[PDB]
């Protein structure tokens, strides 16, 4: 607070209460200026005084915070609402919004009509969006230099942990194209979480191998069971199998030790019975979903029982669909005399076991009922592979979004840097009250790539200087090729000429970034009447 305290609950009337609210709005934003981009910086938020969390994501930061003003309150919720939407635009949206709200209360107040003043802000975003739609000059992965091969290459060079864009470019191309499930949300799209990406420790540090068809992860090292019988047909049992507990459970209500005991003797026998019947059908490899205890591991090994274990359910789940097996379609027992089907078997070209790089894999070559691929990263450690995966995932997300909306832009603050000059040429042209409306809208766009620059320590001054030159009054064109630059790599923090990097983000996120920053000005304004309630 400041002003009189004649009334309370964020009422002080006149100039003072407006001034109080906008400063506070600005404090939130300043936190998120330093955390802006993929260059964003870690913050420490102390949550009591015996707890801490380390975060560097824009929406997350704001959630833990203690709002205590109406301006505070509307701005956190705007960020969180955007997090719900996509979760991209989250660092940026706040920063633009801080400037907008302050400028607009002044201009709406300086009315001829208040609906007209707000409409100018709308008019600036309508040109912006239109521009954004017209553009296919940067972030096009479908008419790239090498299509999806180039898009991935530049993405892996921007998020480099070694030598990448080499082996790793090819992976991105494979994984999107390995899903043949079209998800019609505006144009055909593929999930990038229906892919199987696997880690393998041992051998060459920065490598990849493409596998035709999905693969099941396991390891041999203390097993004596067969599971490496080369075949072509898999019986996929969603069904748990355990030699100790698959009928038994702890009862402490039955006095007699017999009931617990008897079922246990019988469950060593029936496991042996159960496997032969499944095999007879057509399989020589069985994939069994249930997990196993370290204590139980010795029994399966000793009895000699034919089972695939140390399985990963997610891997198994992909195989069953692709082979055309069903995991569940007739089972309902827990005896070893249990029925089994010839349709719960699936088909592959071969089900062959290779051990490559110190990891045993059963590899399903060329799956039938639909085709896939599984890319297994190769590091000299398991840890190396986590880094490589996370960077690749980013590459894969940007590619998928590109498929949905044909139209693309160099995303981040780069679309913004272009639009500043254009919405200014337009502001001037219109004149009157609307010239201010667009012009405050416009200058707010220039500031975000400059603030981002600071974070990677390339500075604001260096950024503006290089960039505005390329834009001109006869280079207002959207083109489809460079003659003026318009992108801006955001990791580099200075403009380059990589026009398909994964630090660009398409039209889908960037249109809603513009709308959410404006909305914050409309909304704080939306009130009619101010009262204190005792």
């Amino acid at each position: 607070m400041e002003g009189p305290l004649s009334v309370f609950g964020d009422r002080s009337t006149g100039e003072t209460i407006r001034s109080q609210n906008v400063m506070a709005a600005a404090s939130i934003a300043n936190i998120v200026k330093s955390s802006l981009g993929p260059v964003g910086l870690d913050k420490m938020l102390v949550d009591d005084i015996g707890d801490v969390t380390i975060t560097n994501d824009g929406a997350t930061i704001l959630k833990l915070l203690e709002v205590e003003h109406p301006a505070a309150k509307v701005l956190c919720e705007l960020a969180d609402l955007q997090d719900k939407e996509v979760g991209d635009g989250t660092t940026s949206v706040v920063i633009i919004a801080a400037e907008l709200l302050k400028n607009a209360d002044e201009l709406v107040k300086q009315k001829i009509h208040p609906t007209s003043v707000i409409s100018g802000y709308r008019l600036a975003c309508k040109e912006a969006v239109r521009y954004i739609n017209e553009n296919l000059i940067v972030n096009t992965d479908e008419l790239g230099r090498d299509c999806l091969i180039n898009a991935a290459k530049t993405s892996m060079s921007s998020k480099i942990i070694g030598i990448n864009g080499d082996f790793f470019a090819n992976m991105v191309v494979d994984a999107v194209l390995a899903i043949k499930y079209t998800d019609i949300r505006g144009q055909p799209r593929y999930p990038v979480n229906s892919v199987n990406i696997l880690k393998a420790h041992g051998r060459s540090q920065m490598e990849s191998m493409l596998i035709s068809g999905y693969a099941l992860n396991c390891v041999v090292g203390s097993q004596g069971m067969p599971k490496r019988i080369v075949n072509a047909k898999i019986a996929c049992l969603d069904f748990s199998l355990q030699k100790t507990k698959m009928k038994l459970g702890v009862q402490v209500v039955i006095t007699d030790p017999e009931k617990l005991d008897q079922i246990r003797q019988r469950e060593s026998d029936i496991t042996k019975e159960r496997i032969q019947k499944i095999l007879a059908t057509g399989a020589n490899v069985i994939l069994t979903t249930g997990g196993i205890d370290d204590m139980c591991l010795k029994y399966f090994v000793e009895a000699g029982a034919m089972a695939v274990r140390r399985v990963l359910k997610r891997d198994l789940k992909r195989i069953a669909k692709a082979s055309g097996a069903t995991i569940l379609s007739t089972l309902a027992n827990l005896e070893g005399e249990e029925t089994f089907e010839a349709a719960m078997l699936g088909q592959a070209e071969e089900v062959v076991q290779e051990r490559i790089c110190d990891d045993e894999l059963i590899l399903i070559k060329n799956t039938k009922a639909r085709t896939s691929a599984s890319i297994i990263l190769r590091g000299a450690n398991d840890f190396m592979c986590d880094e490589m995966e996370r960077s690749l995932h980013d590459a894969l997300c940007v590619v998928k979004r590109v498929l949905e909306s044909k139209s693309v832009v160099p995303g981040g603050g780069a679309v913004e840097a272009a639009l500043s000059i254009y919405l200014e040429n337009y502001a001037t042209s219109m004149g009157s009250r609307e010239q201010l409306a667009i012009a405050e809208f416009a200058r707010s766009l220039l500031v975000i790539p400059n603030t981002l620059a600071v974070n990677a320590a390339q500075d604001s001054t260096d950024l503006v200087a290089k960039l505005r030159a390329f834009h001109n009054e006869a280079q207002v064109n959207p083109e489809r090729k460079n003659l003026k630059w318009i992108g801006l790599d955001l990791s580099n923090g200075k403009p380059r000429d990589n026009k398909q990097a994964g630090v660009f983000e398409p039209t889908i996120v960037k249109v809603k970034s513009l709308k959410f920053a404006t909305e914050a000005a409309i909304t704080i304004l939306r009130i009619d009447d101010l009262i204190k309630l005792h």
Partner: protein, 513 residues
């Protein structure tokens, strides 16, 4: 609630907090040492050579202080030593780097300099690492002895050596091909009351002290078979509440015997089938135990599943449901000796085991019950050097020579490379050098003049084979001296320190909500 303070303002508060901790521990490390005295809020004295202890008992602050407590805890779990080391590295780097490079104006460049100093440091420090064998004991003897007398113990040095050296090597993991690092839980130490050193046994296996606790439970069987619940015991152990009334008198009698009745049904199963060892993860009692002793069968009780499965590899027999289930052997042999020694009415079963994952809990004996505690600390330091050597036969002949070795190494490179990197890289070079200088402070004279002779010695003779010792504060051939720093401690301490100093530089908001 929300508190806003921006930039270089926040970044000084971090220096302020870190350095104050770092200074005395910078003196406490070495083969010379100081004391950080706590004046307690309840009064009285507690004084340690370890800064984290004193922070924990009182004084926690928002930035650095909480970070130093948290990284150092991870460090104890890992190698088990160098808890002391982390905190100093993190504070000296943040101290010296930040101020000159902020006035100039470039925070994010400094973060990239920390990487370039991480990359340099690994390469140069590994070249000076000298291979020794782990099939030659007399070589491993020299390195392990230093770790002991870094705490300033020389009385109980010799005893720690003989137990630790053989023992850690036999620890595998359940990949079985390694060896290497044998991080704690796969190696442990547990103590037994009083004792003296003639009551000490070398134990390369694991000991269970809730095994044979009576002179009517298993004597000596070279390889036992441990029987898991199943069909020779039961999973049940509880009371039934089928129908209950407080009104009923006979209800109070029924309910209490139902616990005891259940225990007798479990213990009757073991009698009828004849194990020689049974394992319960639920945890039996004394009174439950008794019924097992007439059949002359030992019970292992108050254990956990991960311990019994590793211990089954060690003992020489796999996990079997009952003594009438016999199938293919996962381990057919594993124990070389079974030994039992009694102190009080509690018998302690020692079981020597070679080349199995186990848990490897080794015996120790102090001069008294108090001394068991101090002995147990010396072994935590000793078993660390065995996992270090077993991982990498290459280790540094350091002795504070090692910090120094890297510090001068970086100064040479900053000059050669030139480029925008050279000023932040030269800043971190110097931070590392503050530390070995403090070791010479305890010794005497003008510290910096002595340090100069080290600088000239690094390019000319050797980096750290001929290095400096902090007890002489002069150059001594470090290899002849037989003071060697464990490579594994130095590798990890230096990795975490850059990161904790790097985290604080990134922070430029502290909120309190």
């Amino acid at each position: 609630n929300t508190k806003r303070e921006s930039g270089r303002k926040v970044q000084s508060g971090n220096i302020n907090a870190a350095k104050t901790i770092a200074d005395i521990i910078r003196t406490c490390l070495g083969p010379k040492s100081m004391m950080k005295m706590l004046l307690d809020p309840m009064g009285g004295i507690v004084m340690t050579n370890d800064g984290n202890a004193i922070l924990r008992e009182i004084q926690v602050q928002h930035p650095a202080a909480k970070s130093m407590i948290e990284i150092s805890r991870t460090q104890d779990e890992e190698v088990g030593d160098g808890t002391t080391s982390v905190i100093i590295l993190a504070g000296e780097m943040l101290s010296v780097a930040e101020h000159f490079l902020e006035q100039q104006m470039h925070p994010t460049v400094v973060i990239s300099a920390y990487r370039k100093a991480l990359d340099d440091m690994i390469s140069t420090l590994k070249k000076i690492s000298i291979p020794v064998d782990i099939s030659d004991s007399d070589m491993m003897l020299n390195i392990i002895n230093s770790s002991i007398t870094t705490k300033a113990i020389s009385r109980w040095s010799s005893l720690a050596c003989n137990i630790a050296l053989d023992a850690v090597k036999m620890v595998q993991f359940e990949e079985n091909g390694r060896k290497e690092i044998d991080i704690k839980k796969y190696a442990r130490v547990e103590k037994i009351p009083g004792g003296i050193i003639e009551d000490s046994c070398v134990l390369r296996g694991v000991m269970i002290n809730k095994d044979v606790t009576h002179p009517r439970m298993r004597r000596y069987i070279k390889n036992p078979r441990i029987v898991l619940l199943d069909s020779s015991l039961e999973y049940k152990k509880g009371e039934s509440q089928t129908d209950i009334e407080i009104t009923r008198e006979e209800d109070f009698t029924r309910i209490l015997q139902m616990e005891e009745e259940y225990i007798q049904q479990l213990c009757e199963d073991i009698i009828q089938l004849k194990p020689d060892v049974v394992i319960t993860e639920k945890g039996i009692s004394d009174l439950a135990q008794h019924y097992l002793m007439r059949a002359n069968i030992t019970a292992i009780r108050r254990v956990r599943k991960t311990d019994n499965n590793r211990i089954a590899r060690a003992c020489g027999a796999r996990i079997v449901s009952r003594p009438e289930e016999l199938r293919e052997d996962d381990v057919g042999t594993g124990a070389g000796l079974l030994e039992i020694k009694k102190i009080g009415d509690e018998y302690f079963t020692f079981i020597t085991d070679c080349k199995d994952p186990k848990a490897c809990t080794i015996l120790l004996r102090g001069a008294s019950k108090e001394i068991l505690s101090e002995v147990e600390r010396n072994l935590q330091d000793a078993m660390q050097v065995c996992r270090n050597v077993l991982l990498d036969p290459q280790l540094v002949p350091g002795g504070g020579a090692s910090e120094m070795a890297v510090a001068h190494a970086l100064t040479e490179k900053s000059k050669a490379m030139t480029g925008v990197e050279q000023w932040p890289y030269r800043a971190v070079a110097q931070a590392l050098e503050v530390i070995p200088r403090t070791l010479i402070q305890n010794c005497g004279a003008s510290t910096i003049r002595l340090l100069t002779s080290l600088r000239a010695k690094h390019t000319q003779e050797n980096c750290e084979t001929w290095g400096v010792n902090g007890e002489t504060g002069t150059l001594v051939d470090m290899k002849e001296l037989g003071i060697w720093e464990p490579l594994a401690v130095k590798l990890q301490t230096y990795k975490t320190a850059v990161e904790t100093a790097v985290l604080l530089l990134r922070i430029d908001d502290i909120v309190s909500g």
